Design a protein around this nucleic acid. Structure first.
Ligand SMILES: [Mg+2]
Ligand SMILES: [Mg+2]
Lengths: 239, 239
DNA sequence: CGTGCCAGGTGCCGT
DNA sequence: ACGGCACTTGGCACG
């Protein structure tokens, strides 16, 4: 079928081969319901025993294997990986990524369903409420930080690390912002501390770090105060 | 129902409702190829225009929407979400996470396929090469760091943060390790630096930080040296 | 390309 | 639950 969808339940091997072939050839979406084994070797090494999973191969090369639980595929393979279907005692999907070299091997013990989905999507996701949006707010409304704040750079490389927003205040200090779109953790305060220390090595003792977020974890608040750093409450804007 | 798979191409709304509702009640995997619009509101806010996607709803509430590219769902919902099918101008899949309130709405414009996959999986993933396994190696073979190293605590909480490994050396110094199973970057060093500074205040300047990892980024090397910390090369072990 | 970092990050484990 | 952090993190923007 050259309808959007082809489905075959309990395929024969040649049926199985046929659909996998066409999926790849047509830049379609291959979906398989099968009982399988999965072997991964790559950055790490992985084994998964016999069980039912859903398998998806995207035309861009992405490979997903999902069990009945979580949000995360049990094994996978990133965009740009090449897949082929080898016939050994059972059919085996083999997907290889290079740089770094990673091979994914799915032995298909029984294929309950194979399907080809020739999917048209021209639309891109529009997302609001991000950190960049916070940045834009600050550049178009600096008073949202403090009065007379003068934002200068965004995503600026200082020597070691990249600062979210860099600027000055009314009294002439350098001011660093670390923004976070959620509750700020130790991770963030360490970013901020790191930057501020580097800027001090040049502009000496007049520099302020300011952590801009909707809130802080206990430890963030703790460490923040300890190192004499500041916090301003800010929500990411939605539009 | 006994069949692993139930699938219907071009299903009527009646047929859709049957299988969708069966999927939830039977606690099975729902799979749908469809033309759809997507609306997300939650931590952020999101709009996806009309186009074709694969949709998976797992019995544990996890909800996936995959376009024909990348590895990441364009929208999703975490485990423990609750989904209902709603009949409005078109069928709408509605997944609601509470705690934090997050709403996903999938308007099904045309459903090309709906399927129920009753998947039996008793197997769990066995992965090796983790950072945890790095730590285990070090406690079994402390010499992989340096002669005379005596590892003592693992994931030990110092006042602010949690140190991966705390130990002592031949000079009887307190020693911090941060482990990375892959090439270490600036925040690895920031972590280490953070911990060490905290301990220096208790135990003095004797205290050594060591970054333990298969390799370093240029930037990490730079900050490491600048702060007088150390680097030991270690590859994560694979069973 | 490698470096650095956000992400609706997710998952895990501790208190 | 909140916290602190690893993850085969993935994906992006920038030098
Ligand atoms: Mg930053
Ligand atoms: Mg660690």
């Amino acid at each position: 079928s050259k309808d959007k969808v082809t489905v075959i339940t309990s395929p024969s091997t040649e049926e199985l081969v046929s659909l996998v072939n066409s999926a790849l050839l047509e830049e379609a979406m291959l979906t398989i319901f099968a009982r399988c084994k999965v072997h991964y070797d790559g950055r790490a090494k992985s084994e998964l025993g016999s069980g039912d999973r859903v398998i998806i191969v995207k035309p861009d090369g992405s490979f997903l294997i999902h069990q009945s639980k979580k949000r995360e595929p049990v094994n996978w393979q990133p965009p740009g990986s090449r897949v082929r279907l080898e016939l050994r005692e059972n059919p085996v999907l083999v997907s290889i990524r290079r740089k770094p070299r990673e091979t994914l091997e799915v032995e298909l013990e029984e294929v309950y369903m194979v399907s080809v989905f020739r999917a048209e999507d021209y639309e891109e996701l529009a997302l609001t409420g991000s950190e960049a949006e916070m940045a834009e707010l600050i550049f178009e409304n600096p008073e949202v930080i403090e009065p007379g704040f003068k934002p200068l750079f965004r995503e600026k490389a200082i020597g070691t690390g990249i600062v979210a927003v860099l600027g000055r205040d009314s009294d002439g200090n350098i001011v660093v912002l670390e923004l976070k779109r959620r509750r700020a953790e130790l991770h963030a305060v360490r970013q901020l501390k790191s930057y501020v220390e580097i800027l001090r090595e040049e502009y000496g003792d007049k520099v302020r770090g300011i952590l801009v977020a909707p809130s802080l974890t206990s430890g963030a608040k703790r460490l923040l105060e300890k190192e004499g750093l500041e916090f301003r409450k800010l929500e990411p804007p939605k539009r």
